[PDB]
Design a protein around this ligand. Structure first.
Ligand SMILES: Cc1cc2nc3c(=O)[nH]c(=O)nc-3n(C[C@H](O)[C@H](O)[C@H](O)COP(=O)(O)O)c2cc1C
Length: 176
């Protein structure tokens, strides 16, 4: 079976394309793609590496499928699991809520013993606040935006996948 579980929350379906652009680089032998709706606690524990994609909506809201799973997420064993986060957003009016829901996963996985990878630079975050920040210089996960919407996506998710592949040591699996 695959060693990486990619799980993506969605509404407009944009995150499915991100999950596929991740999986195609890693290879199907290395990564598989899921939506938390079909998951149980053991469905994550089966994997060593977990890529948890989450969009943010309606002023820092998490999508209902992930929100309903959070009381199960806090029971999952993450001890020694490698975890990376990804997301997309709009912040023109949502200026304090850009990719807010990244913080919601990041808060739960660490005390359950996760090892975090896959930071992404802000390149000088411009707006009021964002809860996905690990530092003012970098988000804790991939957070794509280009003029209030996700575009110029493929080059950014290629760079992010290549970065996690050298933290996770998937690079020496996928380039073989
Ligand atoms: C009414 C509305 C509210 C939104 N609220 C936020 C928000 O609080 N934070 C954010 O980062 N993005 C926000 N977004 C942007 C969406 O996350 C983004 O455009 C995209 O549609 C997400 O698609 P996906 O869930 O299918 O991946 C919002 C979009 C709309 C239309």
């Amino acid at each position: 079976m695959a060693i990486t579980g990619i799980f993506f929350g969605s509404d407009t379906g944009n995150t499915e394309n991100i999950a596929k652009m991740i999986q195609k680089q890693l290879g199907k032998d290395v990564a598989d793609v899921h939506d938390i709706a079909k998951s149980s606690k053991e469905d994550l524990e089966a994997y060593d590496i977990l890529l948890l994609g989450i969009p943010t909506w309606y002023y820092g809201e998490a999508q209902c499928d992930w929100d309903d799973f959070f009381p199960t997420l806090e029971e999952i064993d993450f001890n020694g699991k490698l975890v990376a986060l990804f997301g997309c957003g709009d912040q023109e009016d949502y200026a304090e809520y850009f990719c807010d829901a990244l913080g919601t996963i990041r808060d739960i996985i660490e005390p359950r013993g996760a090892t975090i990878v896959g930071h992404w630079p802000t390149a000088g975050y411009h707006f009021e606040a964002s809860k996905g920040l690990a530092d003012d210089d970098h988000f804790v996960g991939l957070a794509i935006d280009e003029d209030r919407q996700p575009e110029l996506t493929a080059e950014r998710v290629e760079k992010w996948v290549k970065q996690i592949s050298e933290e996770l040591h998937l690079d020496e699996i996928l380039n073989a």
